[PDB]
RNA sequence: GCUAAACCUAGCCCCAAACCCACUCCACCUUACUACCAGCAACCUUAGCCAAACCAUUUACAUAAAGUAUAGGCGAUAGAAA
RNA sequence: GAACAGCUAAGAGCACACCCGUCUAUGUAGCAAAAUAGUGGGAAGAUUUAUAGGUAGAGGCGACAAACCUACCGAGCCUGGU
RNA sequence: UCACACUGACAAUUAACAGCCCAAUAUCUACAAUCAACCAACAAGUCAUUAUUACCCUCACUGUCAACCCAACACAGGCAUGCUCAUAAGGAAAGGUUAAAAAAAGUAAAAGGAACUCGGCAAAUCUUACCCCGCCUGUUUACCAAAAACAUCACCUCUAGCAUCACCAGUAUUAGAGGCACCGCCUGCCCAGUGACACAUGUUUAACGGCCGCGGUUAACCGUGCAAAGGUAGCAUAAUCACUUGUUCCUUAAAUAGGGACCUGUAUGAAUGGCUCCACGAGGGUUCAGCUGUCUCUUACUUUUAACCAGUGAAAUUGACCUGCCC
């Protein structure tokens, strides 16, 4: 089955005049005139090429001519890359362990609700003029309000002033598996930076013991399946800042996912996979900026967090990169899926049920505050 | 049908027209870590933040002016929390529309089937600030109720339709930052920013060099008036039921380098002729000239930085609500 | 639905009115999400000279003499500019790389 | 019902049906315009 | 007479292509088939009828995996997207094909028979005698065309030399080459003929206008014709 | 006597002779009366009313020869040339 | 793309806006070459509708009225054969 | 010059309201909307990019009026979107005098409340039983017939082994051409004739269509002739030629009206579909309690109308008329 349809494709041109097949006179064509003519023969114009370059009407060369056209097709990854399997694909591409439970230090750092409820109600109903808002409206608003609520505790911890939450921040990182080349790209949300690096959660004992278990395969599905295959990518890594910039080390990737429609969302499993991939890429970029580009085992492992999206459902991911040589030891990540703060909200009164959220739990806010603290 | 008032306008000498439509009183003047943080926030978007896509002149105010201002406001709110505890529990809305509706004066139909009938012309300000702060409690009064200040108000001896200000019909909205069912209804400071249209370079290219500060003054006046009117209507007050207490407000404007501050003091809400013949009160709106925050930036280093602007920003953000 | 009214920008609906218009000669182009860019090169720059010391007036006096009309043509111009042609015993063959070309109206008035 | 209103006004449909371009697109409109010109009408098309 | 066919998509895309209904109209504008038009909007999904087709730099067999089983509005039988390797492709779903199942796609004609599951596919030269099959192709590398509706399934009769006679669901014998590929089992969406419509609302939603009102006088073609089976048509 | 009729110049038709017009400025093939950007365009027996009381054959769109030879359900009608 | 209040609870019932027009009485140069007030069926669906394109007479369409196709369609109008 | 929106000159409307649109190479768009978070489905669905090449010249153009459109008009005719379902907006049924006759829109009734009329037809009291047709809902002659017809889901007949322009981007549970029309009993005979399928002297009837006559014993039954079969079940004077106001009971005191059982129905009848059946039809009839001036027997009142005063001001029609009755 050939997809195309002859009627939709470009119509085949008419047959050349029988006068050109005579070797070799001058076929009297209408080239002398500047308009279509029915009688007389049809000429064969040459391929015209514009002398000057017009940005409004500029044609790019083909793929066979480029400055860095490589033969090894590297598969890049971005926010739009919707995975297929789920978290297992991200774990295989990153080579890290999956722990179903947050660390002990973060949970212990915890040791109020009216403010959170008011902020939720505001962002969900009162933050706009019209009724029944949309995800694209209250998702970034919810994220910003939560960040502000978490940062308002600077009076208690004076060390929370040495950080900032930027917006348009990107990153890049390249690594090999067995043995193709991969690549990642920046995000499209927020990003919290810190002056000093985060502390090491897991010790070297766990890093050495992780050599026992292995990765989880998924035959016959390949780790690419959904990753974007794109040539001409430039392997030269890059970050979102330049040398000598305050607050260089990251802390928590506050990426969001707008989209008012369900099909335009990223799903929980695929969103967690994308978050893990982004955290691994940021950690690798930070390691390459601190150390060299050689493949070896790092001595001072870094830590990069990330929070889920969606005003209702929420996810947590605490990455911990300790080795740059993939191809040995591996990393470990702590996940907390399907946390979801408040179950449902009733913008209008149904006829029975008041105007407000239902099914709220404070553990989500406590975990958010603990993740925001960590270093303070 | 009501005149669609735009705070960010480009008309000439629109300050007098706005003062007449609002009945205000303008008055010139006012009633180490922070500097480093501001310089870092600047240099960030000015050089450090590697832009994937090449930014042009039209995509500058929307990619380097808004994020930098947002980061500056966030850093200020975070650093001023210990000294100002009222800012910790404050609600900050990033990019939220501000609407307000009111009536002013009368107007007889010139031609049509409605000729010979009094039609009170209406107005509406649909401001869209970049980010504002909200506090449950109200700000102090600064200026007492009912002030003399003998400076008169512009007259405007012509139809208001002459100035590029046309009429349009749509849903009348009176919105501050949230709905009436919210405790965080009051605020204090407000931030704005003009687009590539109202650029001082564009005004210098033409001959409207004297309108540079006038545009900022009119925008600040419109924003403050809309804010105060909407927040007073949220409390139940309106034309007939005049406000019993003043609704002071503050707003800061800029364009990318020059900064200036403006104050306000809402005194009355009855702008119609039915309650203006015996209304000796009037609103006030303080202001200052535009000063440059920094001369230029070389690669990754400020040149002539200014500390007075930062000091004024700190003084404006540290005002505690009584 | 008259057939005598000249079709202008005050007849068609919103789309027609927006697309059509008067013969005012556009300046620049339109790109992006409704972002018209003005090209300074296409803007008509009026070269106005200095009128200081201009002893001429837009009205002639009645005391001037009457003379016959002499249609200036190529032959008259060549006869007037014949000094170097006779002294020899200034012409361009191709004006493709010329700024103010003759046959192709590249200038304006 | 009242069938006296058989004409629905619309400039787009009028210009698309009795348009100069639609007329010249086929010899029908060409002959129509030629006849209208030979007759001497002031308005040839809509 | 502006009539452009929406079937304009060279690249095999997975997203539902916007289907522009026809209503029985041809390129001119006249109706040639009554009873088509006025239905609910639908979106066609590019189906990959050709079961066997390796990806880039590939040749040998390759396994597959089922992800989900969705419904197709353009046909009676449901579908189920299956991912194989570094790409995906919509294909027809078989009976008892749950999510996560493994589908084998090979083309090597083994010496003996191969016990095929209820989803995999192998050439007719490696199928036991008397086995229900569907999505049979006409020529080597042509594409599935026969037996593709809901519940339809043809049984394998016998093999003669390098050919194989397939008993189509219509009790008609068809000789197909042995090197051709064809799925096994019956198509999903069982008990479809028993699906009672209930009301004309669903009939109109499906996109079927009511029949004409002319009282056609039944002629000679209305009588029952007890015809025998037709001769076996081959493609060799 | 109120309402109402009277005025030839404009112009046209029939002929002789001769072969007539088509860029002050700008637009004119898309929504003609629009300054400014990447597609195939025509070469086809005319039919029919009518007449033969209807109609199916058939019927036209210089002078003389001569309406002669001829065709015509051998009829209404057609119809030349040397 | 838009439309469908409200009440009792499924191409459910009543009922706003809206689509259609079974009867009464006025008129047939009438307001109207198909109108006026009430009594009526539908009104979450096979429904109505704003925009544009396509199907035209030796035909198109038709939940068939052999009905409709710009006020007269058992088959339209205008040009020449009239 | 109903009365004074009719002539020549005077200038508004200023866009920010919506359009005027995206330079290419290739590659990613499967987990609906219905407060979308539980359930719950079917009609399977309305909004999103990637690396590179080249580009940092920027605020021009179209409408901004009104009592407005389409119907020969200043026409009781038609017109969608957001807001209020009587308002902050939107208008004057009465040019003056009288109550002629008649007509239309309404108000009240001593007594009956369908006895007037072919008919419970405008009127409000307001709801019940028995029959015909159709399954419903909807569509049907725009503009006299809006149904008992057209259609509808169920049933069944015939044709096709199949890719690029509708069918179809489909594959004998599919597509095309058709009779009737769910559910219950069900649908009995036939190719003599026409047509179709045949190439096997045949099959097809849920194709077009047809399913006996005579004498004897109201009748089992007997003999005879024709033919492929001689009307099967059912139902009944029906929506059913004439006989026919059929026989008979009820329904009115008064019944060619209606319902209940019978067929000499010689011309009813089983997908030309026959008989029952819980829902429903502005489809067609009867009827028990209540009624409304339809009547017995009508009147009084308000408005338009009606009569005089002022003006604009006509149609169809007219042979001229000095325009009667009886035989
Ligand atoms: Mg049918
Ligand atoms: Mg039928
Ligand atoms: Mg004749
Ligand atoms: Mg209903
Ligand atoms: Mg109803
Ligand atoms: Mg009929
Ligand atoms: Mg005649
Ligand atoms: Mg207007
Ligand atoms: Mg009319
Ligand atoms: Mg009046
Ligand atoms: Mg009167
Ligand atoms: Mg009475
Ligand atoms: Mg009676
Ligand atoms: Mg009587
Ligand atoms: Mg009645
Ligand atoms: Mg019916
Ligand atoms: Mg219809
Ligand atoms: Mg009718
Ligand atoms: Mg109708
Ligand atoms: Mg009717
Ligand atoms: Mg029927
Ligand atoms: Mg039968
Ligand atoms: Mg009878
Ligand atoms: Mg009776
Ligand atoms: Mg009905
Ligand atoms: Mg009079």
Curated annotation (Swiss-Prot), chain A:
Keyword Transmembrane helix: no
GO molecular function, a single term: RNA binding
Listed GO CC annotations: mitochondrial inner membrane; mitochondrial large ribosomal subunit; mitochondrial ribosome; mitochondrion
Gene Ontology BP terms: mitochondrial translation; translation
Localisation per UniProt entry: Mitochondrion
InterPro entries: mtLSU_mL37, Ribosomal_mL37/mL65
Main location class: mitochondrion
Keywords: Mitochondrion, Ribonucleoprotein, Ribosomal protein, Transit peptide
Record bears the keyword Ribosomal protein: yes
Subunit structure: Component of the mitochondrial large ribosomal subunit (mt-LSU). Mature mammalian 55S mitochondrial ribosomes consist of a small (28S) and a large (39S) subunit. The 28S small subunit contains a 12S ribosomal RNA (12S mt-rRNA) and 30 different proteins. The 39S large subunit contains a 16S rRNA (16S mt-rRNA), a copy of mitochondrial valine transfer RNA (mt-tRNA(Val)), which plays an integral structural role, and 52 different proteins. mL37 forms a heterodimer with mL65.
Protein family membership: Belongs to the mitochondrion-specific ribosomal protein mL37 family.
Protein's name according to its UniProt entry: Large ribosomal subunit protein mL37
Lineage: Eukaryota, Metazoa, Chordata, Craniata, Vertebrata
Underlying gene: MRPL37
From Swiss-Prot, chain B:
Tissue: Heart, skeletal muscle, kidney and liver. Lower expression in placenta and peripheral blood leukocytes.
GO biological process: apoptotic process; mitochondrial translation
Keywords: Mitochondrion, Ribonucleoprotein, Ribosomal protein
Disulfide bond listed as a keyword: no
Keyword Mitochondrion included in the entry's annotation: yes
One GO location term (cellular component): mitochondrial large ribosomal subunit
One MF term in the entry's GO annotations: RNA binding
Subcellular location: Mitochondrion
Protein family: Belongs to the mitochondrion-specific ribosomal protein mL65 family.
Assembly notes: Component of the mitochondrial large ribosomal subunit (mt-LSU). Mature mammalian 55S mitochondrial ribosomes consist of a small (28S) and a large (39S) subunit. The 28S small subunit contains a 12S ribosomal RNA (12S mt-rRNA) and 30 different proteins. The 39S large subunit contains a 16S rRNA (16S mt-rRNA), a copy of mitochondrial valine transfer RNA (mt-tRNA(Val)), which plays an integral structural role, and 52 different proteins. mL65 forms a heterodimer with mL37.
Protein name, UniProt field: Large ribosomal subunit protein mL65
The species this protein was found in: Homo sapiens (Human)
Source lineage: Eukaryota, Metazoa, Chordata, Craniata, Vertebrata
Stretch of the intact protein here: 89 to 430 of 439
Swiss-Prot record, chain C:
GO CC annotations, alphabetized: mitochondrial inner membrane; mitochondrial large ribosomal subunit; mitochondrion; ribonucleoprotein complex
Annotated keywords: Apoptosis, Cell cycle, Mitochondrion, Ribonucleoprotein, Ribosomal protein, Transit peptide
Main location: mitochondrion
Pfam families, sorted: MRP-L27
Tissue: Present in kidney, liver, thymus and testis, and at lower level in brain and spleen (at protein level).
Cysteine pairs bridged by disulfides in the record: none
GO biological process terms held by the UniProt record: apoptotic process; mitochondrial translation; translation
Protein origin, superkingdom: Eukaryota
Acyltransferase listed as a keyword: no
Compartments reported by the entry: Mitochondrion
Any one Gene Ontology molecular-function term assigned to this protein's record: RNA binding
Family in the record: Belongs to the mitochondrion-specific ribosomal protein mL41 family.
Subunit structure and binding partners: Component of the mitochondrial large ribosomal subunit (mt-LSU). Mature mammalian 55S mitochondrial ribosomes consist of a small (28S) and a large (39S) subunit. The 28S small subunit contains a 12S ribosomal RNA (12S mt-rRNA) and 30 different proteins. The 39S large subunit contains a 16S rRNA (16S mt-rRNA), a copy of mitochondrial valine transfer RNA (mt-tRNA(Val)), which plays an integral structural role, and 52 different proteins. Interacts with BCL2.
Protein name per UniProt: Large ribosomal subunit protein mL41
Species, as recorded: Homo sapiens
UniProtKB/Swiss-Prot annotation, chain E:
Highest taxon, organism lineage: Eukaryota
GO CC terms in record: mitochondrial inner membrane; mitochondrial large ribosomal subunit; mitochondrion; nucleoplasm
The keyword Nuclease is assigned to this record: no
Biased amino acid composition, Basic residues: 214-223
This protein's record includes keyword Mitochondrion: yes
GO molecular-function terms, A-Z: RNA binding; structural constituent of ribosome
Region span, Disordered: 204-223
Family stated for the protein in its record: Belongs to the universal ribosomal protein uL2 family.
Subunit annotation: Component of the mitochondrial large ribosomal subunit (mt-LSU). Mature mammalian 55S mitochondrial ribosomes consist of a small (28S) and a large (39S) subunit. The 28S small subunit contains a 12S ribosomal RNA (12S mt-rRNA) and 30 different proteins. The 39S large subunit contains a 16S rRNA (16S mt-rRNA), a copy of mitochondrial valine transfer RNA (mt-tRNA(Val)), which plays an integral structural role, and 52 different proteins.
Designated name of the protein: Large ribosomal subunit protein uL2m
Organism: Homo sapiens
Lineage summary: Eukaryota, Metazoa, Chordata, Craniata, Vertebrata
């Amino acid at each position: 089955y050939e997809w195309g349809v002859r009627s939709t494709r470009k119509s085949e041109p008419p047959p050349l005049d029988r006068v050109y097949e005579i070797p070799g006179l001058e076929p009297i064509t209408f080239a002398g005139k500047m308009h279509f003519v029915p009688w007389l023969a049809r000429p064969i114009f040459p391929p015209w090429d514009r002398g000057y370059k017009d940005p409004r009407f500029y044609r790019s060369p083909p793929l066979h001519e480029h400055p860095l056209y490589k033969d090894q097709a590297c598969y890049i990854f971005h926010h739009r890359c919707r995975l297929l399997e789920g978290v297992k694909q991200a774990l295989w591409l990153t080579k890290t362990k999956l722990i179903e439970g947050l660390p002990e230090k973060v949970l212990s750092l915890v040791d109020q609700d009216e403010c959170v409820l008011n902020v939720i109600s505001h962002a969900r109903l009162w933050q706009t003029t019209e009724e029944i808002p949309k995800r694209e409206t209250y998702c970034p608003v919810i994220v910003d309000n939560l960040i502000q609520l978490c940062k308002s505790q600077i009076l208690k911890h004076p060390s929370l002033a040495r950080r900032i939450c930027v917006q348009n921040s990107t990153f890049s990182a390249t690594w090999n598996r067995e043995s193709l080349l991969l690549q990642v790209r920046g995000s499209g949300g927020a990003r919290l930076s810190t002056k000093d690096p985060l502390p090491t959660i897991a010790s070297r004992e766990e890093i050495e013991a992780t050599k026992n278990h292995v990765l989880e395969t998924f035959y016959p599905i390949s780790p690419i399946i959904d990753l974007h295959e794109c040539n001409i990518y430039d392997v030269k890594n890059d970050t979102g800042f330049q040398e000598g910039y305050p607050y260089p080390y990251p802390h928590t990737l506050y990426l969001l996912d707008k989209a008012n429609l369900r099909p335009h969302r990223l799903q929980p499993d695929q969103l967690r996979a994308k978050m893990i991939l982004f955290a691994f890429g940021s950690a690798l970029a930070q390691a390459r900026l601190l150390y060299g580009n050689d493949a070896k085992v790092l001595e001072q492992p870094v830590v990069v967090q990330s929070v889920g999206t969606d005003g209702r459902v929420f996810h947590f991911l605490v990455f911990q990169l300790n080795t740059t040589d993939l191809d040995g030891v591996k990393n470990l990540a702590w996940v907390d899926s399907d946390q979801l703060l408040y179950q449902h909200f009733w913008c209008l009164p149904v006829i029975v049920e008041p105007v407000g959220p239902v099914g709220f739990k404070p553990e989500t806010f406590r975990k958010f505050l603990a993740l925001y603290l960590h270093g303070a | 049908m009501k005149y669609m008032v735009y705070p960010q306008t480009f008309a000439l000498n629109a300050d007098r027209w706005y003062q007449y439509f609002t009945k205000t009183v303008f008055l010139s003047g006012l009633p180490a870590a922070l500097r480093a943080v501001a310089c870092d926030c600047l240099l960030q978007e000015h050089f450090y933040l590697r832009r994937r896509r090449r930014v042009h002149r039209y995509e500058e105010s929307e990619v380097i002016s808004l994020p930098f201002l947002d980061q500056l406001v966030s850093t200020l709110v975070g650093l001023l929390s210990p000294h100002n505890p009222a800012l910790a529990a404050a609600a900050l809305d990033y990019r939220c529309p501000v609407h307000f509706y009111w009536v002013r004066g009368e107007e007889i139909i010139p031609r049509g089937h409605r000729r010979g009938r009094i039609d009170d012309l209406r107005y509406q300000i649909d401001d869209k600030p970049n980010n504002q702060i909200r506090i449950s409690k109200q700000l102090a009064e600064f200026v007492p109720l009912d002030y003399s200040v003998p400076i008169e108000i512009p007259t405007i001896k012509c139809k208001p339709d002459k100035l590029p200000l046309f009429k349009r019909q749509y849903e009348n909205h009176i919105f501050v930052g949230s709905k009436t069912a919210d405790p965080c209804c009051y605020g204090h400071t407000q931030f704005h920013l003009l687009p590539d249209k109202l650029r001082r370079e564009r005004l210098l290219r033409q001959n409207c060099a004297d309108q540079i500060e006038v545009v900022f003054r009119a925008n600040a006046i419109a924003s403050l008036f809309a804010w105060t009117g909407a927040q007073a209507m949220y409390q139940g007050f309106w034309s007939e039921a005049d406000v019993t207490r003043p609704f002071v407000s503050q707003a800061v404007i800029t364009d990318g380098k020059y900064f200036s501050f403006f104050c306000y003091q809402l005194n009355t809400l009855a702008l119609t002729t039915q309650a203006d013949q015996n209304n000796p009160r009037k609103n006030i709106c303080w202001g200052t000239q535009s000063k440059p925050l920094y001369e230029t930036i070389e690669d990754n280093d400020v040149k002539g930085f200014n500390d007075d602007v930062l000091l004024q920003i700190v003084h404006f953000l540290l005002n505690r609500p009584k | 639905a008259d057939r005598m009214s000249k079709w202008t920008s005050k007849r068609g609906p919103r789309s027609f009115r927006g697309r059509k218009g008067r013969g005012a000669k556009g300046i620049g182009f339109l790109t992006s999400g409704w972002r018209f860019v003005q090209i300074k090169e296409m803007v008509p720059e009026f070269v106005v000279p200095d009128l200081t010391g201009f002893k001429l007036k837009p009205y002639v006096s009645y005391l001037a003499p009457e003379s016959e009309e002499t249609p200036l043509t190529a032959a008259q111009l060549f006869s007037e500019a014949v000094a170097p042609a006779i002294e020899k015993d200034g012409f361009e063959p191709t004006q493709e790389g010329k700024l103010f070309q003759l046959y192709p109206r590249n200038f304006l008035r | 019902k009242a069938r006296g209103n058989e004409y629905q006004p619309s400039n787009i449909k009028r210009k698309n049906k009795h348009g100069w371009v639609r007329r010249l697109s086929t010899p029908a409109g060409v002959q129509v315009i030629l006849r209208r010109m030979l007759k001497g009408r002031k308005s040839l098309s809509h | 007479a502006n009539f452009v066919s929406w079937k304009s998509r060279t690249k095999y895309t997975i997203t539902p292509v916007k289907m522009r209904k026809s209503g029985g109209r041809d390129h001119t504008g006249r109706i040639r088939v009554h009873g088509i038009g006025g239905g609910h909007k639908q979106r066609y999904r590019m189906i990959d009828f050709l079961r066997f087709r390796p990806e880039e730099t590939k040749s040998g067999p390759f396994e597959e995996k089922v992800i989900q089983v969705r419904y197709d509005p353009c046909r009676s039988a449901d579908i189920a997207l299956v991912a194989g390797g570094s790409r995906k492709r919509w294909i027809i779903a078989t009976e008892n094909m749950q999510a996560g199942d493994t589908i084998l796609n090979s083309n090597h004609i083994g010496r003996m028979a191969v016990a095929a599951r209820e989803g995999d596919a192998h050439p007719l030269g490696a199928l036991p005698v008397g086995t229900l099959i569907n999505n049979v192709e006409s020529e080597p590398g042509r594409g599935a065309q026969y037996i593709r509706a809901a519940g339809t399934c043809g049984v394998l009769l016998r093999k003669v030399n390098g050919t194989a006679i397939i008993q189509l669901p219509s009790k008609r014998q068809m000789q197909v080459l042995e090197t051709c590929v064809a799925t096994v089992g019956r198509v999903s969406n069982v008990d479809h003929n028993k699906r009672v419509i209930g009301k004309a609302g669903r009939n109109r939603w499906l996109g079927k206008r009511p029949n004409s009102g002319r009282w056609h006088r039944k002629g000679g073609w209305a009588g029952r014709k007890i015809r025998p089976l037709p001769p076996m048509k081959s493609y060799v």
